[PDB]
Symmetry: D2
Subunit: 103 residues, 4 copies
Amino acid sequence: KNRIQVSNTKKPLFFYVNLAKRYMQQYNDVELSALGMAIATVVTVTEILKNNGFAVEKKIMTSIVDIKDDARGRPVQKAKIEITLVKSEKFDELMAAANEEKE
Amino acid sequence: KKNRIQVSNTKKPLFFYVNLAKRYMQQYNDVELSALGMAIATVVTVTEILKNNGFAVEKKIMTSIVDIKPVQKAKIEITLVKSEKFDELMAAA
Amino acid sequence: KKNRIQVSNTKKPLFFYVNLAKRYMQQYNDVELSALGMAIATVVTVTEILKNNGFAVEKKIMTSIVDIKPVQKAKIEITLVKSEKFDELMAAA
Amino acid sequence: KNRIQVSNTKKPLFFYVNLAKRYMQQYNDVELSALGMAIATVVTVTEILKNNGFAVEKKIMTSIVDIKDDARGRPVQKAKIEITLVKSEKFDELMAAANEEKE
Ligand SMILES: [K+]
Ligand SMILES: [K+]
Ligand SMILES: [K+]
Ligand SMILES: [K+]
């Protein structure tokens, strides 16, 4: 329910940042994952959410996985990152303040 | 289309695209590489590799902002041709 | 030089470059962003953000291969200008 | 002695791949590290060395670190990756075969 897999090169960065914010709001945590070239996206989303006070990381796992590859004839190996973020203590205030709604 | 490589698969290893570019140059002489957004880095790297290792010469490198059904994304389009060393490098491989 | 941002520092957060571009546009109207190789992805992303969020319009996007004292690297050069909404977005911030 | 930090945007990818090969040849292992945008480089070097039979990973650590930042006035947070690779059992044969020197 709260998992985001980054793989669509058509999506703007803020699609993923905003989805991560929505999932943290709904579920308290969010899991981001990506392979290969998409790892830079997950890293950047995480940096943004940390530097701007929205999130605290709970788990960052990075590993090499086998990917089935028909044309190759045997699996290819790719790096995969998996990041779990939880809501920070400032998340609600910051989401409020975005729209000048802090009390 | 036949000699165009669109880079959009995060499951592929880099060398998939490097080798595909070399195979396309063997048949068509020239090769078009295109990508959006986060995939531009791969196209750039493919190009650098083919240039630095003596396989290719660039003919055209176009970067622009495009609308996707709308959101805006950067798109790169690179056209490469065989270098004077290409055939000998391929034979040596 | 004064209104050019070279992206080459891996220690910087993305929003360093996004905010610097916005500050430069406030003073100069327009801003040049440049990078090599692995940094091109950052320039692309900065640009997409400034376009998608209504701050900027692109005027020029140049990608080329350059010699570095030699090895060849891709280099992007983007020029942005303020959009019609820029001043109001900055005031609202 | 065997550490490679990826941070120079002037370097071609194969500078890092070839340095990693040299360090594995000399020391049996190599440590690759990078922050932020440079993580994609380390990931790609690792994929290359794995898919092509040169290396086996031993450790991949990915974390958020504080970076001193004068202009900011307090530290910024960046993702950092640290990858330790060791020579594979095929490394020597492959380095030989590169130059048609296998026996
Ligand atoms: K309120
Ligand atoms: K094709
Ligand atoms: K400047
Ligand atoms: K021999």
